[PDB]
């Protein structure tokens, strides 16, 4: 690729060629054309998976949710044309996106009658039948997560950053637990690294040892970060990763800091998070010795808006770990209230 | 940190912010004017080393040699100002750039700067890797590299100039003198490399991908030649190229046959050995080569004087005693 | 401003200062913070409007809708805090965005009880009330369009194109029919001009006379384009403008093309439109004097989905004008069918 | 068409695509090397004009003068090759750049190129506005402007180099030699302007804002000096500056009082007249000035040799016959 960057401090214009990594943090929210395989093969795969166990989909990320939403109507029309009584319904996504134990099989042959393109500008609206292929969205009462598909697609060719290009996908032949590597970008330049994909922006730094600076997470996935896109994959103990391995956290030493361990019981039920190492407003944390035992993450404010302004710690280091969500400001598992009892606070009820 | 980029295969362009890694090897050494933090302190360090017992300096890279050559005049003036019988003789570099077991101590008689003066003092009283780039003294928007004298003892290469990036199905492990490319073809393998210098320091693990589970016998570039300890540095059917054309000045590891030869894989072919050129000294071009268990296309080095082959590829019929060998090992 | 441009087909750059206009179309579906006056002043204005007789708000564009949507909760909380029985309900914007004959008043004196900033965290969510202050979204039967408000806000300060910035607003003192002249950018450089807005992107060119090249509309406002942001204001009549003056079309000769007149009967019900001068896929246009007179815009396809092949034009010029909506490819008022009767085609029922 | 920009008042930066208008007036004439499409055809046109009865060329802008200066030698060589008694004499321009009623026809004795040679031939047998920039011969990324010879007869300036832009509460009317700025303070008025040349052609209406409802007596920069026919070219309390310091080589119309003077609005002051400097011939500075019905701050011109005032501002007590007047009218 060819590119050119600019600095606005004083002046320079550096052009050249190489590897460029951008944020693309909200890459789901944009206009794209999605081509999940072919119109007749996807319908055949769904038809095979219907009477073979799997209820629906447990989409890995939000891009999969949008890809399914943009094609559900056409897929239903094709299924109606083939005389199959199935109806795909797509709902909202919730965090964390729990892993599914099944996958969509690749069909032997396409369905007999159908189309050849995903961009048909007119088709007859499909009717609704009894069967429902629920693609996520609060439908755990009909049938649980144990009968759902997860991580079934691979992106072959894609265009992101641009605003109208097409995205080509295909169904996995085998079962894999790792995240999609086609959309992952990892770069280092001097004393600043980054571990990014379509939903994660992890930043690292080198002050005394390579540690974690901050992280922006619009999704809480559950796949495994591929090791081919990671740095210091050796000599790491999985209990020291700030972002747990079960939440698509890199198996890297750039994901660690002194005095902290895996944040299993964090506020992963939020919609967007920012792991910042700073003190939430109106509060102070001091490294004591008689502080409480490590436990679930507690919000810095009560359920009635009152702010607890005194917290302690046992062996951690400053600045303290804190999660910034929309509802409020949270802390890590190692920081506990210094005077207030544990009962009068809101805890984190989700675990990784 | 802010910029635009375009792909010329599919006519799509975009702009944004992030991390950009550039190829600083095509326009090589006509930029990045190395100079120390203060030449006065470098003179004191050199003097302390000289009365310590260090004959001179063995340059780690070409940038260090350029720095020494540019400092030469000011260093000589500073040494002569205080009346010290010590003159710096900055010579040319000759690959590979070997390793000396000395470091500059932080503060007639000629101070060797790694020229053709091995008989003056052997490679045992010569310093090596005694310089550290200052913290904020390097950057992409920065055509003036500032240096100082290291305090500790280390073997790793300087990480302030190293840039590693991955985007999809392509990686790169690059610095001011290396440009190693990788690709995904059913596996992560080695696409090509463009080496204009051959260091001996250790590639820091901080800038490496698949550092775990790697055996130090499958890397195409040896670990003792500043090759990454990565699975991206390997390819199927090959092993470490200890005996290669490392005496050159600018190689380009290309996985294609030389223009005029053909490599046929057969069990009857010979074993591993030193790398050989495709052309004899008289100019005759050997036409046929054999390999034992490698995978086509073959591994070849594109030097200034021909097209060398890998260690696993041998001439099919012509005896190897009539071909030019490799006289340098890592 | 300071900026630097890049050219990639010619490998050359440029750096300097000046006035830069960007393609900020769809600067609503983005993450900004809105501050529509003091929280105690907006509530007092709403109360005064309800007392006078105003029962609703008609959004000028798609940004005012988001401004109301991100404010309604806090505004209702303040209203209940002050003891006022009134609730604000925000719906969805529908094209075209018609005109309301009234505007929000200046309350002079604000409400006593409340807070001072719009970023208040953890306000007690208000309870529902019988009285409703609807903001658009299918309420024409409860609060008719003649009892609504329109252009009651002015942008005082804004940062657009940079995420998480603040947008400052205030209530107009006098009634006006013009659009907001703070987000509008007009630029001409050589033989290519542009008129820009938050939802408009109109392009012109010089072949032998200045003419309309293409347009891109995501919203269809009914305000009036401010005259200070227009090129060739004089010598033009409101019968040659391709985009009608009643639909916030510039009063410029750059808005006119040879052969066509003002098109007040088009596919203005569409959510997104693109005015392109080229034939729809599979059709053909011929110029003859036997063709019919002007009328409502007709779709290239029918309700059944069959593409009409042959079309005629009376006195226009090629390439033919064409609207590119989501559901098809419409024509202008001057291009009537050649063989099929007009009664068998999907018609445009909306007039400007 | 693709680029990034930053704001230095509030630290925000953004990237995207659109129309970018640059300030090409600060770095003036050290770029955009004008040259015709083919010197041979220009030579034939000049010869045909000479036998037609055209004494020479009256330059429209500084770019045309620089083009003629650069072409002079090659044009003379081409004329001499074919044996023609005709040589071009390129001189320096003097503002204002007046208008000649002739155009070059498309195909001892000296050809005037608008020097200080009014006596050789008056401004009646001289050409003016005979050149047109070719279609793709200009661009923002294009430091080599190609020209040709016009076919028709016109009075407008060349629109290939004119850029007008509006963004919020600030506008600009600019080309290669003008930079006019506007602002919104309860109205659209004139903020400042920086003039490095004084043309005479007509500013095209294609590049003008508020072209309608404007009376040609309120424009600060007159219509006869390539001033936009816009309401952004006006301000309250002032009228057309027909008699200003238009003999200077570089002005800057700034709405601030001169450094050492004070203006008070009073009805007893004089009437409109030629512009006067703030300093006398001997260097004495007039300390008090008066205005009849204008609006503060006053209108002043910043030439290379002082600080002139507008035509509505007169000295309060010192008679106007002891001050330097303006000897040029538009």
Tab-separated table of N, CA and C in Angstrom, chain A residues 1-8 11-24 156-162 165 181-192 194 196 201 203 210 226-234 254, chain B residues 1-8 10 12-24 26 31-32 135 140-143 159-172 179 188 204-213 232:
chain	number	residue	atom	x	y	z
A	1	UNK	N	0.825	-1.202	0.000
A	1	UNK	CA	0.000	0.000	0.000
A	1	UNK	C	0.862	1.256	0.000
A	2	UNK	N	0.289	2.364	-0.459
A	2	UNK	CA	0.973	3.650	-0.507
A	2	UNK	C	0.213	4.636	0.366
A	3	UNK	N	0.945	5.411	1.162
A	3	UNK	CA	0.303	6.324	2.086
A	3	UNK	C	1.207	7.485	2.434
A	4	UNK	N	0.646	8.424	3.194
A	4	UNK	CA	1.369	9.628	3.580
A	4	UNK	C	0.720	10.208	4.827
A	5	UNK	N	1.528	10.473	5.852
A	5	UNK	CA	1.043	10.988	7.123
A	5	UNK	C	1.527	12.416	7.330
A	6	UNK	N	0.834	13.137	8.210
A	6	UNK	CA	1.114	14.542	8.481
A	6	UNK	C	1.076	14.772	9.986
A	7	UNK	N	1.993	15.601	10.476
A	7	UNK	CA	2.010	16.031	11.868
A	7	UNK	C	1.699	17.520	11.910
A	8	UNK	N	0.813	17.911	12.823
A	8	UNK	CA	0.357	19.289	12.919
A	8	UNK	C	0.955	20.038	14.102
A	11	UNK	N	5.360	21.146	11.547
A	11	UNK	CA	5.219	20.837	10.129
A	11	UNK	C	6.020	19.591	9.774
A	12	UNK	N	5.464	18.738	8.916
A	12	UNK	CA	6.178	17.724	8.141
A	12	UNK	C	5.131	16.992	7.313
A	13	UNK	N	5.581	16.401	6.210
A	13	UNK	CA	4.717	15.598	5.348
A	13	UNK	C	5.550	14.400	4.904
A	14	UNK	N	5.297	13.249	5.522
A	14	UNK	CA	6.058	12.027	5.289
A	14	UNK	C	5.239	11.064	4.440
A	15	UNK	N	5.645	10.877	3.190
A	15	UNK	CA	5.000	9.922	2.304
A	15	UNK	C	5.866	8.674	2.185
A	16	UNK	N	5.238	7.567	1.804
A	16	UNK	CA	5.974	6.326	1.643
A	16	UNK	C	5.030	5.154	1.467
A	17	UNK	N	5.587	3.955	1.625
A	17	UNK	CA	4.833	2.720	1.480
A	17	UNK	C	5.131	1.805	2.658
A	18	UNK	N	4.143	0.994	3.026
A	18	UNK	CA	4.308	0.062	4.125
A	18	UNK	C	3.011	-0.540	4.625
A	19	UNK	N	2.901	-0.706	5.941
A	19	UNK	CA	1.716	-1.268	6.582
A	19	UNK	C	1.109	-0.194	7.472
A	20	UNK	N	-0.166	0.115	7.245
A	20	UNK	CA	-0.872	1.158	7.977
A	20	UNK	C	-2.020	0.538	8.760
A	21	UNK	N	-2.131	0.907	10.034
A	21	UNK	CA	-3.148	0.378	10.934
A	21	UNK	C	-3.976	1.549	11.445
A	22	UNK	N	-5.291	1.470	11.262
A	22	UNK	CA	-6.220	2.512	11.678
A	22	UNK	C	-7.102	2.007	12.813
A	23	UNK	N	-7.835	2.937	13.429
A	23	UNK	CA	-8.758	2.582	14.503
A	23	UNK	C	-9.871	1.663	14.019
A	24	UNK	N	-10.756	2.187	13.167
A	24	UNK	CA	-11.924	1.445	12.686
A	24	UNK	C	-12.712	0.836	13.844
A	156	UNK	N	-13.360	-13.432	3.482
A	156	UNK	CA	-12.391	-13.736	2.434
A	156	UNK	C	-11.731	-12.465	1.906
A	157	UNK	N	-12.529	-11.551	1.365
A	157	UNK	CA	-12.049	-10.255	0.913
A	157	UNK	C	-12.984	-9.184	1.451
A	158	UNK	N	-12.413	-8.070	1.899
A	158	UNK	CA	-13.213	-7.036	2.536
A	158	UNK	C	-12.632	-5.668	2.222
A	159	UNK	N	-13.485	-4.655	2.339
A	159	UNK	CA	-13.047	-3.277	2.276
A	159	UNK	C	-13.597	-2.479	3.438
A	160	UNK	N	-12.714	-2.005	4.312
A	160	UNK	CA	-13.103	-1.235	5.482
A	160	UNK	C	-12.324	0.070	5.503
A	161	UNK	N	-12.938	1.099	6.077
A	161	UNK	CA	-12.380	2.435	6.029
A	161	UNK	C	-13.006	3.236	4.909
A	162	UNK	N	-13.200	2.586	3.764
A	162	UNK	CA	-14.015	3.130	2.684
A	162	UNK	C	-15.473	2.905	3.057
A	165	UNK	N	-17.790	-0.240	-0.113
A	165	UNK	CA	-17.296	-1.456	-0.739
A	165	UNK	C	-17.985	-2.690	-0.164
A	181	UNK	N	-8.958	-13.481	11.945
A	181	UNK	CA	-7.703	-12.734	11.816
A	181	UNK	C	-7.633	-11.778	10.635
A	182	UNK	N	-8.603	-11.812	9.720
A	182	UNK	CA	-8.535	-10.966	8.534
A	182	UNK	C	-8.715	-9.488	8.854
A	183	UNK	N	-9.295	-9.158	10.004
A	183	UNK	CA	-9.611	-7.781	10.353
A	183	UNK	C	-8.818	-7.315	11.575
A	184	UNK	N	-7.699	-7.969	11.874
A	184	UNK	CA	-6.900	-7.678	13.059
A	184	UNK	C	-5.616	-6.984	12.631
A	185	UNK	N	-5.302	-5.870	13.287
A	185	UNK	CA	-4.078	-5.143	13.018
A	185	UNK	C	-3.273	-4.851	14.269
A	186	UNK	N	-2.020	-5.296	14.290
A	186	UNK	CA	-1.126	-5.108	15.426
A	186	UNK	C	0.147	-4.436	14.938
A	187	UNK	N	0.563	-3.367	15.616
A	187	UNK	CA	1.722	-2.609	15.171
A	187	UNK	C	2.510	-2.103	16.369
A	188	UNK	N	3.822	-1.967	16.176
A	188	UNK	CA	4.724	-1.379	17.159
A	188	UNK	C	5.597	-0.359	16.447
A	189	UNK	N	5.849	0.771	17.103
A	189	UNK	CA	6.721	1.794	16.525
A	189	UNK	C	7.382	2.545	17.682
A	190	UNK	N	8.575	2.107	18.047
A	190	UNK	CA	9.330	2.739	19.131
A	190	UNK	C	8.972	2.143	20.494
A	191	UNK	N	8.247	2.914	21.304
A	191	UNK	CA	7.830	2.491	22.636
A	191	UNK	C	6.313	2.541	22.790
A	192	UNK	N	5.583	2.265	21.711
A	192	UNK	CA	4.124	2.309	21.732
A	192	UNK	C	3.595	1.225	20.808
A	194	UNK	N	0.132	-1.554	19.819
A	194	UNK	CA	-1.321	-1.535	19.703
A	194	UNK	C	-1.779	-2.917	19.266
A	196	UNK	N	-5.326	-4.206	17.785
A	196	UNK	CA	-6.609	-3.690	17.341
A	196	UNK	C	-7.311	-4.665	16.405
A	201	UNK	N	-9.397	-1.765	20.831
A	201	UNK	CA	-8.242	-0.880	20.642
A	201	UNK	C	-7.430	-0.893	21.936
A	203	UNK	N	-3.937	-0.369	23.894
A	203	UNK	CA	-2.736	0.444	23.780
A	203	UNK	C	-1.766	0.091	24.896
A	210	UNK	N	7.085	-3.177	29.627
A	210	UNK	CA	5.942	-3.105	28.723
A	210	UNK	C	4.656	-3.425	29.472
A	226	UNK	N	-6.038	-14.661	17.994
A	226	UNK	CA	-5.042	-15.482	17.300
A	226	UNK	C	-3.632	-15.074	17.695
A	227	UNK	N	-2.764	-16.070	17.850
A	227	UNK	CA	-1.419	-15.811	18.342
A	227	UNK	C	-0.508	-15.218	17.277
A	228	UNK	N	-0.869	-15.342	15.997
A	228	UNK	CA	-0.064	-14.784	14.917
A	228	UNK	C	-0.098	-13.265	14.887
A	229	UNK	N	-0.984	-12.644	15.664
A	229	UNK	CA	-1.132	-11.196	15.712
A	229	UNK	C	-0.757	-10.638	17.080
A	230	UNK	N	0.141	-11.308	17.801
A	230	UNK	CA	0.418	-11.000	19.197
A	230	UNK	C	1.924	-10.934	19.429
A	231	UNK	N	2.304	-10.232	20.497
A	231	UNK	CA	3.681	-9.888	20.822
A	231	UNK	C	3.993	-10.384	22.228
A	232	UNK	N	5.179	-10.962	22.434
A	232	UNK	CA	5.471	-11.661	23.691
A	232	UNK	C	4.391	-12.694	24.018
A	233	UNK	N	4.336	-13.702	23.156
A	233	UNK	CA	3.455	-14.842	23.344
A	233	UNK	C	4.088	-15.939	24.190
A	234	UNK	N	5.313	-15.734	24.666
A	234	UNK	CA	6.040	-16.729	25.438
A	234	UNK	C	6.405	-16.170	26.806
A	254	UNK	N	2.193	-7.338	26.979
A	254	UNK	CA	1.704	-5.970	26.873
A	254	UNK	C	0.311	-5.815	27.458
B	1	UNK	N	0.809	10.344	12.972
B	1	UNK	CA	-0.321	9.730	13.658
B	1	UNK	C	-1.615	9.966	12.885
B	2	UNK	N	-1.598	10.964	12.004
B	2	UNK	CA	-2.727	11.289	11.142
B	2	UNK	C	-2.254	11.262	9.698
B	3	UNK	N	-2.995	10.578	8.835
B	3	UNK	CA	-2.574	10.497	7.449
B	3	UNK	C	-3.594	9.780	6.595
B	4	UNK	N	-3.251	9.651	5.314
B	4	UNK	CA	-4.097	9.008	4.321
B	4	UNK	C	-3.301	7.925	3.608
B	5	UNK	N	-4.017	6.960	3.035
B	5	UNK	CA	-3.380	5.868	2.313
B	5	UNK	C	-4.288	5.423	1.177
B	6	UNK	N	-3.681	4.792	0.175
B	6	UNK	CA	-4.402	4.310	-0.996
B	6	UNK	C	-3.853	2.945	-1.387
B	7	UNK	N	-4.728	2.095	-1.913
B	7	UNK	CA	-4.340	0.825	-2.509
B	7	UNK	C	-4.473	0.957	-4.021
B	8	UNK	N	-3.403	0.637	-4.745
B	8	UNK	CA	-3.399	0.792	-6.192
B	8	UNK	C	-3.932	-0.428	-6.930
B	10	UNK	N	-7.018	-2.141	-5.934
B	10	UNK	CA	-8.412	-1.721	-5.951
B	10	UNK	C	-8.462	-0.235	-5.620
B	12	UNK	N	-9.337	2.322	-4.043
B	12	UNK	CA	-10.016	2.794	-2.844
B	12	UNK	C	-9.013	3.527	-1.966
B	13	UNK	N	-9.391	4.714	-1.497
B	13	UNK	CA	-8.538	5.526	-0.644
B	13	UNK	C	-9.290	5.905	0.624
B	14	UNK	N	-8.539	6.061	1.712
B	14	UNK	CA	-9.127	6.362	3.009
B	14	UNK	C	-8.152	7.198	3.825
B	15	UNK	N	-8.691	7.871	4.838
B	15	UNK	CA	-7.906	8.682	5.755
B	15	UNK	C	-8.343	8.397	7.185
B	16	UNK	N	-7.410	8.552	8.114
B	16	UNK	CA	-7.712	8.290	9.506
B	16	UNK	C	-6.491	8.475	10.374
B	17	UNK	N	-6.533	7.866	11.556
B	17	UNK	CA	-5.442	7.936	12.514
B	17	UNK	C	-5.106	6.541	13.024
B	18	UNK	N	-3.833	6.341	13.356
B	18	UNK	CA	-3.373	5.057	13.849
B	18	UNK	C	-1.864	4.938	13.911
B	19	UNK	N	-1.335	3.779	13.525
B	19	UNK	CA	0.100	3.516	13.528
B	19	UNK	C	0.521	3.188	12.103
B	20	UNK	N	1.516	3.913	11.596
B	20	UNK	CA	1.999	3.754	10.231
B	20	UNK	C	3.453	3.310	10.254
B	21	UNK	N	3.759	2.249	9.511
B	21	UNK	CA	5.112	1.717	9.398
B	21	UNK	C	5.571	1.892	7.957
B	22	UNK	N	6.696	2.577	7.775
B	22	UNK	CA	7.195	2.935	6.457
B	22	UNK	C	8.452	2.143	6.127
B	23	UNK	N	8.781	2.114	4.838
B	23	UNK	CA	9.969	1.421	4.345
B	23	UNK	C	11.114	2.424	4.287
B	24	UNK	N	11.947	2.436	5.330
B	24	UNK	CA	13.111	3.310	5.392
B	24	UNK	C	14.372	2.640	4.861
B	26	UNK	N	14.599	1.719	1.155
B	26	UNK	CA	14.809	2.067	-0.248
B	26	UNK	C	15.636	3.342	-0.384
B	31	UNK	N	19.635	10.135	4.891
B	31	UNK	CA	18.715	10.674	5.886
B	31	UNK	C	19.202	10.217	7.256
B	32	UNK	N	18.534	10.715	8.298
B	32	UNK	CA	18.747	10.277	9.678
B	32	UNK	C	20.206	10.476	10.099
B	135	UNK	N	15.466	9.095	24.433
B	135	UNK	CA	14.046	8.757	24.467
B	135	UNK	C	13.271	9.470	23.363
B	140	UNK	N	9.313	9.334	13.381
B	140	UNK	CA	9.129	9.406	11.936
B	140	UNK	C	9.176	10.853	11.458
B	141	UNK	N	8.620	11.779	12.236
B	141	UNK	CA	8.624	13.195	11.867
B	141	UNK	C	9.897	13.872	12.359
B	142	UNK	N	11.033	13.211	12.143
B	142	UNK	CA	12.261	13.559	12.861
B	142	UNK	C	13.466	13.061	12.057
B	143	UNK	N	14.041	13.949	11.252
B	143	UNK	CA	15.248	13.621	10.489
B	143	UNK	C	16.514	14.074	11.208
B	159	UNK	N	15.673	-0.970	20.346
B	159	UNK	CA	14.266	-1.051	19.939
B	159	UNK	C	13.640	0.282	19.569
B	160	UNK	N	14.377	1.388	19.668
B	160	UNK	CA	13.807	2.687	19.337
B	160	UNK	C	13.650	2.901	17.839
B	161	UNK	N	14.256	2.053	17.010
B	161	UNK	CA	14.206	2.190	15.561
B	161	UNK	C	13.484	1.036	14.886
B	162	UNK	N	12.872	0.137	15.650
B	162	UNK	CA	12.279	-1.086	15.123
B	162	UNK	C	10.772	-0.916	15.013
B	163	UNK	N	10.216	-1.340	13.881
B	163	UNK	CA	8.784	-1.290	13.673
B	163	UNK	C	8.226	-2.570	13.086
B	164	UNK	N	7.287	-3.189	13.794
B	164	UNK	CA	6.642	-4.421	13.365
B	164	UNK	C	5.145	-4.181	13.250
B	165	UNK	N	4.545	-4.661	12.162
B	165	UNK	CA	3.126	-4.434	11.931
B	165	UNK	C	2.518	-5.634	11.222
B	166	UNK	N	1.230	-5.855	11.471
B	166	UNK	CA	0.448	-6.887	10.802
B	166	UNK	C	-0.886	-6.284	10.392
B	167	UNK	N	-1.342	-6.612	9.184
B	167	UNK	CA	-2.662	-6.168	8.736
B	167	UNK	C	-3.227	-7.253	7.818
B	168	UNK	N	-4.018	-8.149	8.400
B	168	UNK	CA	-4.705	-9.157	7.619
B	168	UNK	C	-3.865	-10.377	7.303
B	169	UNK	N	-3.342	-10.438	6.083
B	169	UNK	CA	-2.562	-11.571	5.602
B	169	UNK	C	-1.157	-11.141	5.196
B	170	UNK	N	-0.594	-10.167	5.907
B	170	UNK	CA	0.747	-9.693	5.605
B	170	UNK	C	1.346	-9.055	6.849
B	171	UNK	N	2.612	-9.367	7.111
B	171	UNK	CA	3.340	-8.841	8.254
B	171	UNK	C	4.648	-8.227	7.778
B	172	UNK	N	5.347	-7.572	8.700
B	172	UNK	CA	6.660	-7.012	8.408
B	172	UNK	C	7.425	-6.869	9.717
B	179	UNK	N	14.217	-5.328	6.241
B	179	UNK	CA	12.827	-5.276	5.793
B	179	UNK	C	12.417	-6.706	5.453
B	188	UNK	N	1.753	-19.299	7.858
B	188	UNK	CA	2.517	-18.058	7.925
B	188	UNK	C	3.966	-18.374	7.574
B	204	UNK	N	15.039	-7.773	19.608
B	204	UNK	CA	14.294	-7.810	20.870
B	204	UNK	C	12.976	-8.548	20.706
B	205	UNK	N	12.637	-9.349	21.716
B	205	UNK	CA	11.391	-10.100	21.674
B	205	UNK	C	10.175	-9.193	21.781
B	206	UNK	N	10.365	-7.943	22.215
B	206	UNK	CA	9.255	-7.009	22.367
B	206	UNK	C	8.555	-6.726	21.048
B	207	UNK	N	9.207	-7.016	19.927
B	207	UNK	CA	8.746	-6.638	18.600
B	207	UNK	C	8.596	-7.867	17.711
B	208	UNK	N	8.151	-8.982	18.289
B	208	UNK	CA	8.154	-10.268	17.608
B	208	UNK	C	6.791	-10.938	17.749
B	209	UNK	N	6.417	-11.699	16.721
B	209	UNK	CA	5.116	-12.346	16.598
B	209	UNK	C	5.336	-13.851	16.524
B	210	UNK	N	4.535	-14.630	17.256
B	210	UNK	CA	4.845	-16.047	17.469
B	210	UNK	C	6.278	-16.232	17.973
B	211	UNK	N	6.508	-15.673	19.157
B	211	UNK	CA	7.757	-15.887	19.871
B	211	UNK	C	7.791	-17.231	20.588
B	212	UNK	N	6.637	-17.856	20.802
B	212	UNK	CA	6.537	-19.099	21.548
B	212	UNK	C	6.459	-20.296	20.608
B	213	UNK	N	6.962	-21.432	21.084
B	213	UNK	CA	6.886	-22.658	20.317
B	213	UNK	C	7.772	-22.700	19.097
B	232	UNK	N	7.203	-16.377	11.633
B	232	UNK	CA	7.140	-15.680	10.356
B	232	UNK	C	8.487	-15.658	9.649
